[PDB]
Design an enzyme around this catalytic site. Sequence first.
Site, mmCIF file in Angstrom:
data_model
loop_
_atom_site.group_PDB
_atom_site.id
_atom_site.type_symbol
_atom_site.label_atom_id
_atom_site.label_comp_id
_atom_site.label_asym_id
_atom_site.label_seq_id
_atom_site.Cartn_x
_atom_site.Cartn_y
_atom_site.Cartn_z
ATOM 1 N N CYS A 194 0.982 -1.199 -0.034
ATOM 2 C CA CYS A 194 -0.100 0.086 -0.145
ATOM 3 C C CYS A 194 1.107 1.229 -0.057
ATOM 4 C CB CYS A 194 -0.823 -0.128 1.232
ATOM 5 S SG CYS A 194 -2.136 -1.283 1.012
ATOM 6 N N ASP A 214 16.032 6.419 10.769
ATOM 7 C CA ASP A 214 14.753 6.193 10.435
ATOM 8 C C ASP A 214 13.848 5.185 11.087
ATOM 9 O OD1 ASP A 214 12.955 7.195 8.384
ATOM 10 O OD2 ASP A 214 13.327 5.780 6.842
ATOM 11 N N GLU A 237 6.662 2.311 -6.631
ATOM 12 C CA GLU A 237 7.928 2.196 -6.206
ATOM 13 C C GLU A 237 8.526 0.783 -5.728
HETATM 14 MG MG LIG Z 1 10.972 5.032 3.933
#
Ligand SMILES: [Mg+2]
Length: 298
Positions: free
Chosen positions: A16, A126, A20
């Site tokens: 979802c 991240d 990419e």
């Molecule tokens: Mg990311």
Amino acid sequence: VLMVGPNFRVGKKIGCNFGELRLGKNLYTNEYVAIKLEPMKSRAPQLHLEYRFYKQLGSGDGIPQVYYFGPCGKYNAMVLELLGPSLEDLFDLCDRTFSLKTVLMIAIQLISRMEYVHSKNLIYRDVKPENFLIGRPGNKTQQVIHIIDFALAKEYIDPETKKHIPYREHKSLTGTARYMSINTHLGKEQSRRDDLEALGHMFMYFLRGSLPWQGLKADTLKERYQKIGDTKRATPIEVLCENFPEMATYLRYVRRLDFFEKPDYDYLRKLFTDLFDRKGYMFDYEYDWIGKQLPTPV
Ligand SMILES: [Mg+2]
Ligand SMILES: COc1ccc(/N=c2/[nH]c(N)c(C(=O)c3ccc(OC)cc3)s2)cc1
Ligand SMILES: [Cl-]
Ligand SMILES: [Cl-]
Ligand SMILES: [Cl-]
Ligand SMILES: [Cl-]
Ligand SMILES: [Mg+2]
């Protein structure tokens, strides 16, 4: 285009992503893979640098295998191991709370996963539930929490001097606001401590179901980051971590690390393994999501 590299068939868009991410198949080995694509025209290319960080990491527990980087039509493509759902996907499946046992099994693994990344002279930068994925049954790693998405990583030991990167400020904010460390909000250069703090925030998100700064909005991104950081600073650890003393101890410890300091990963793991044993839990990989229908690209 039908193929990437000599041997990878390009399949359907999955997850979802907006194209990419595609399913692929290694025709030579009859194995499914993930194909990450980035337009060659990208104004902010990240995929090749990501590939280079994977090469620096090398082969490791809970790190997806990477098979190929190269062109595919008007895209650059990276072909990597197909993993299972993310922790965010699984969290949704479990009605947006995880048990302490599940959080501790995750946490014990992710302290080690971050230790590994740091041992390769990288900081991750991240942390978010979307970037931690279980394996697929077919590779006997469905139980293992993997880490993905190294586009935002950084080498924190300068390779020629072997010195830790210098302290500085005025670093532009871009990351994920929900989990980032207080010092990240303040525009400080991130270091090992910040990865561990962001993990702590994520663990408390899982335990509580939400974090108390999660709903904040503003007219500009900068103002929104500011309000979130202000709320993080204004929320006592003893309050955030009410009913989870070891999480409070973890968070206080990581919040108090100096910029250059090597975390005591052994100590942080032991906080959680001692707790795990004291609660009578068995480390059997019976996470909350076991027995539920998991989303799969096939
Ligand atoms: Mg990311
Ligand atoms: C819920 O649907 C899916 C479940 C598992 C899945 N497996 C993946 N394996 C990987 N190595 C993945 C990635 O590298 C990846 C790549 C891009 C991405 O964009 C949000 C998210 C994940 S996804 C891909 C889709
Ligand atoms: Cl397969
Ligand atoms: Cl582990
Ligand atoms: Cl948020
Ligand atoms: Cl148990
Ligand atoms: Mg492997």
